[PDB]
Amino acid sequence: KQRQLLGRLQDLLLGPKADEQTTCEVLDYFLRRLGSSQVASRVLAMKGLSLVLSDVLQGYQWLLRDLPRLPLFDSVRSTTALALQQAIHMETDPQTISAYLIYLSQHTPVEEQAQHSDLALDVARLVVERSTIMSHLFSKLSPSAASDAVLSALLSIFSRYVRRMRQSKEGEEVYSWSESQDQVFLRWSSGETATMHILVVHAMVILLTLGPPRADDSEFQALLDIWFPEEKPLPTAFLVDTSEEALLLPDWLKLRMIRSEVLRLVDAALQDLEPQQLLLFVQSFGIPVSSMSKLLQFLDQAVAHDPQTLEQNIMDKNYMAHLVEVQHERGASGGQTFHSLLTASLPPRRDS
Amino acid sequence: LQFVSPFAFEAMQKVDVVCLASLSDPELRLLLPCLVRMALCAPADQSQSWAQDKKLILRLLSGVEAVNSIVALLSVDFHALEQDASKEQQLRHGLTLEFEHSDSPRRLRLVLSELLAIMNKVSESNGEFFFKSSELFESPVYLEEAADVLCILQAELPSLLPIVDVAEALLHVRNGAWFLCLLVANVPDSFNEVCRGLIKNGERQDEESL
Amino acid sequence: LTQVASEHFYFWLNSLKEFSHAEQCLTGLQEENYSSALSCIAESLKFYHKGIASLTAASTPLNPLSFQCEFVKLRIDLLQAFSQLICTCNSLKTSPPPAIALQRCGRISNQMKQSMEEFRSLASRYGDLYQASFDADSATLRNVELQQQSCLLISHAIEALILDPESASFQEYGSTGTAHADSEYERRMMSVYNHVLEEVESLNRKYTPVSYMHTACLCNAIIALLKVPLSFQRYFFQKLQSTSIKLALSPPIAVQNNQ
Numbered sequence: 015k016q017r018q019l020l021g022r023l024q025d026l027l028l029g030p031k032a033d034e035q036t037t038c039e040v041l042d043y044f045l046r047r048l049g050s051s052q053v054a055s056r057v058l059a060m061k062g063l064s065l066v067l068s069d070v071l072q073g074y075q076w077l078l079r080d081l082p083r084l085p086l087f088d089s090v091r092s093t094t095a096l097a098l099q100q101a102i103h104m105e106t107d108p109q110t111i112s113a114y115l116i117y118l119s120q121h122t123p124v125e126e127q128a129q130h131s132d133l134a135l136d137v138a139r140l141v142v143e144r145s146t147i148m149s150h151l152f153s154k155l156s157p158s159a160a161s162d163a164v165l166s167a168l169l170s171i172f173s174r175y176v177r178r179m180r181q182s183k184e185g186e187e188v189y190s191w192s193e194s195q196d197q198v199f200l201r202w203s204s205g206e207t208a209t210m211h212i213l214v215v216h217a218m219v220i221l222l223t224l225g226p227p228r229a230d231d232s233e234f235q236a237l238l239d240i241w242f243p244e245e246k247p248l249p250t251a252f253l254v255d256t257s258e259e260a261l262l263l264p265d266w267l268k269l270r271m272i273r274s275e276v277l278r279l280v281d282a283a284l285q286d287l288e289p290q291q292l293l294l295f296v297q298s299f300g301i302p303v304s305s306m307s308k309l310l311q312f313l314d315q316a317v318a319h320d321p322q323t324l325e326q327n328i329m330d331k332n333y334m335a336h337l338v339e340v341q342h343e344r345g346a347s348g349g350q351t352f353h354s355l356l357t358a359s360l361p362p363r364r365d366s
Numbered sequence: 367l368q369f370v371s372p373f374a375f376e377a378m379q380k381v382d383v384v385c386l387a388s389l390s391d392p393e394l395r396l397l398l399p400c401l402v403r404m405a406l407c408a409p410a411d412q413s414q415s416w417a418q419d420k421k422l423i424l425r426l427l428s429g430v431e432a433v434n435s436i437v438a439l440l441s442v443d444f445h446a447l448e449q450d451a452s453k454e455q456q457l458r459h460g461l462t463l464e465f466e467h468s469d470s471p472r473r474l475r476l477v478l479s480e481l482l483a484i485m486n487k488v489s490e491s492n493g494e495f496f497f498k499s500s501e502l503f504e505s506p507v508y509l510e511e512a513a514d515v516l517c518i519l520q521a522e523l524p525s526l527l528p529i530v531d532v533a534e535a536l537l538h539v540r541n542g543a544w545f546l547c548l549l550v551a552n553v554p555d556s557f558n559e560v561c562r563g564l565i566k567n568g569e570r571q572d573e574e575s576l
Numbered sequence: 577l578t579q580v581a582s583e584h585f586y587f588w589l590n591s592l593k594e595f596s597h598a599e600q601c602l603t604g605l606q607e608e609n610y611s612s613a614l615s616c617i618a619e620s621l622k623f624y625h626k627g628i629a630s631l632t633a634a635s636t637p638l639n640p641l642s643f644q645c646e647f648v649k650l651r652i653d654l655l656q657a658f659s660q661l662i663c664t665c666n667s668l669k670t671s672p673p674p675a676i677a678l679q680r681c682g683r684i685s686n687q688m689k690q691s692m693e694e695f696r697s698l699a700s701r702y703g704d705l706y707q708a709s710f711d712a713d714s715a716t717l718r719n720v721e722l723q724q725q726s727c728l729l730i731s732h733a734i735e736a737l738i739l740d741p742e743s744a745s746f747q748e749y750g751s752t753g754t755a756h757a758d759s760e761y762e763r764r765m766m767s768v769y770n771h772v773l774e775e776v777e778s779l780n781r782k783y784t785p786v787s788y789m790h791t792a793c794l795c796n797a798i799i800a801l802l803k804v805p806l807s808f809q810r811y812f813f814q815k816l817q818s819t820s821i822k823l824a825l826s827p828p829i830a831v832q833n834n835q
Contacts, residue, residue: 051460051463052460053460053501053504103463104460104463106462106504106506106508106509107505107506108506143466143467144466144508146466146506146507146508146511146512147506147508149507150506150507155391155392273431298434299427299428299429299430299431299433299434299437300428300429300430300431300432300433300434333406336421336424337424339421340421340424340425340428341428343421343425344425344428366414376615378670379614379663379666380610380611380614380615380666381611381666381669381670382611400670400671403671403672404669404670404672407672408672408673410668410669410672410673410681410786410788411668411669411788412787412788413788416669416788419669440675444674444675444676445676448676522671522674523674523675523676524674524676525674525676525682525683553667553671554663554666554667554670555660555663555664555666555667555670555671555687557663558656558660559690
């Protein structure tokens with residue numbers, strides 16, 4: 015019974031008989047289950063959608079080629095985009111996330127500023143809040159063509175978003191009763207201006223940390239130069255509510271971006287680092303050897319500059335001494351002066 | 367899907383660190399909780415040989431990022447968690463979305479509550495093949511890999527949970543055999559006791575029951 | 577193996593071959609190496625399990641190999657106990673104490689409790705084998721007594737080093753070494769017993785109850801006991817003084833409760 019009814023519906027939708035009311039009602043009767051927390055509900059909804067609709071990524075053509083080729087696609091495109099933006103945080107499979115990201119990149123409602131801002135916000139929530147899925151999408155163990163494609167898509171989305179914000183004129187009505195207090199006015203060193211969400215900034219810098227895509231790097235290089243120019247002051251933003259120094263690079267984000275192999279990012283981040291943050295960073299793990307060497311070099315510079323304050327900020331010098339010792343054993347350069355300071359309050363002990 | 371290689375388990379039983387350094391990265395990720403608990407904790411032995419071994423272990427595990435999250439899980443005070451678990455147990459006498467949005471102590475609390483609930487359900491019942499009492503062990507690592515590491519930490523720090531009852535409970539989990547394997551791998555001395563505990567349930571083949 | 581013609585004799589010869597191989601595996605031990613010690617113990621357990629499978633295949637109603645089966649079972653269980661004890665000595669450094677916390681090393685304390693229970697049960701089972709082996713000669717009884725004494729030595733070492741050194745008011749100081757040993761194996765077993773006992777006394781109070789020295793001395797004692805080769809005796813191969821009881825009686829049965 016169910017199969018025959020589904021087959022009859024297939025003909026009623028794929029043919030010219032399809033209209034706004036029937037298609038919208040049928041889609042809404044299944045789109046609502048996508049955002050449902052029940053995993054089985056969303057799986058069944060997606061499978062039914064695939065059944066209704068019907069080399070690289072041959073098993074995902076139902077979303078790339080079949081679904082867009084719908085006469086009423088433009089009518090429900092905003093609804094589809096909104097539904098995917100709500101379900102992007104509920105759904106968990108990395109490949110499905112990849113397919114959603116590619117569809118959003120290809121089929122963005124670019125014409126409306128509000129829709130672009132909302133899509134950027136949701137993608138930033140994905141990048142920041144969801145880290146394990148982020149690890150899956152760009153797994154260094156098994157890099158794949160899909161990973162490079164979604165990385166390029168995210169770079170394209172963020173690049174076009176910042177390019178659209180560049181077009182904004184001064185004195186416009188963009189300054190209004192913003193629904194989010196997190197909106198921050200960003201001013202570049204070269205006199206450019208734009209208003210941005212700090213979460214989107216965090217997402218943009220995190221995307222850079224993943225390294226350059228193997229296929230295309232023009233977008234990556236362009237974004238990197240826009241955000242991190244060489245031998246020039248970096249862009250700074252001030253909170254519109256209070257005109258105070260916005261924390262554009264929190265400690266966790268800085269720690270994350272040291273891990274990135276890009277030398278420019280880590281060199282920019284290391285500049286003007288306080289002793290407590292420096293100690294917190296060298297306490298962390300997973301940092302590459304060259305970055306570890308640069309951390310030790312900055313530690314040596316801090317010791318040469320202001321050694322007395324560094325002593326007061328150390329909770330326990332034993333762990334730090336052991337850490338610098340094992341890093342030296344690893345082959346990291348620098349830290350000899352810091353190690354000497356740590357060994358000052360560590361007299362010789364019993365042998366064996 | 368991956369399982370800890372037998373060579374790695376034998377290495378941890380023999381507590382020799384050179385071959386552990388020679389071991390590959392995914393196996394290190396599988397055995398990561400026990401390695402993290404090894405260093406950056408109390409010396410226990412207070413012997414210089416174990417000090418050198420701990421130095422080698424710290425050198426080995428420095429080249430991976432998940433240990434940051436593991437240390438974050440370790441920093442949480444366990445007295446409050448102990449009291450909460452005991453109070454919940456006495457009182458009794460989406461999950462993955464919350465897991466992603468929870469910090470270390472809330473993650474410990476929720477997963478420990480779920481594990482205690484499943485343990486109590488197994489103990490109260492006659493073990494009549496409780497197929498799946500939870501849905502927080504799905505294929506993405508947010509419910510699989512971090513969850514398993516967290517479960518290993520829970521089996522370690524709040525020691526009130528005996529390894530045998532956790533082992534009995536894990537059988538009823540949908541993908542619990544892998545969790546059992548890695549948990550026994552992270553506690554090498556527990557192999558024969560968990561085997562004894564599991565073997566003492568079910569006389570015949572149960573007519574090939576689930 | 578090829579010369580034999582029957583079934584049970586073939587399985588018996590195969591089992592003896594496997595036990596000999598398992599014991600030749602024991603000769604690979606060297607002092608202070610514990611990883612290789614555990615490896616050799618595991619390999620010997622594998623060969624012993626194959627051998628005991630073959631042996632229990634050899635049992636028949638005519639001359640059922642009761643003593644051999646029980647002796648091999650107790651040898652396997654003793655080796656398994658040594659393997660678990662080595663695993664716990666490694667767990668001292670493999671499973672550091674919880675931050676919640678001589679109950680600080682809770683897991684090690686519980687594991688040593690289990691090890692003491694297992695060795696006490698092993699000693700009791702060796703005593704049961706001794707009592708059951710009435711037909712056996714003096715040499716076989718002395719060998720089984722030596723095995724039970726090894727089990728009791730490990731148990732007492734566990735107790736004194738870990739569970740309660742305060743309760744260890746041992747009067748071991750005496751003429752133990754002056755005993756007249758009737759065999760090289762017996763003499764070596766008594767010598768290692770004396771050495772381990774005097775080693776335990778020196779560590780009675782010199783360290784904290786879960787010190788690394790305690791486990792070091794304990795596993796040193798384990799490898800020292802395992803260094804000497806197991807010696808079989810007469811009753812394992814040749815059985816004499818075969819005596820049994822028919823035990824008839826006057827009896828699926830019922831009777832009035834009043835009567």
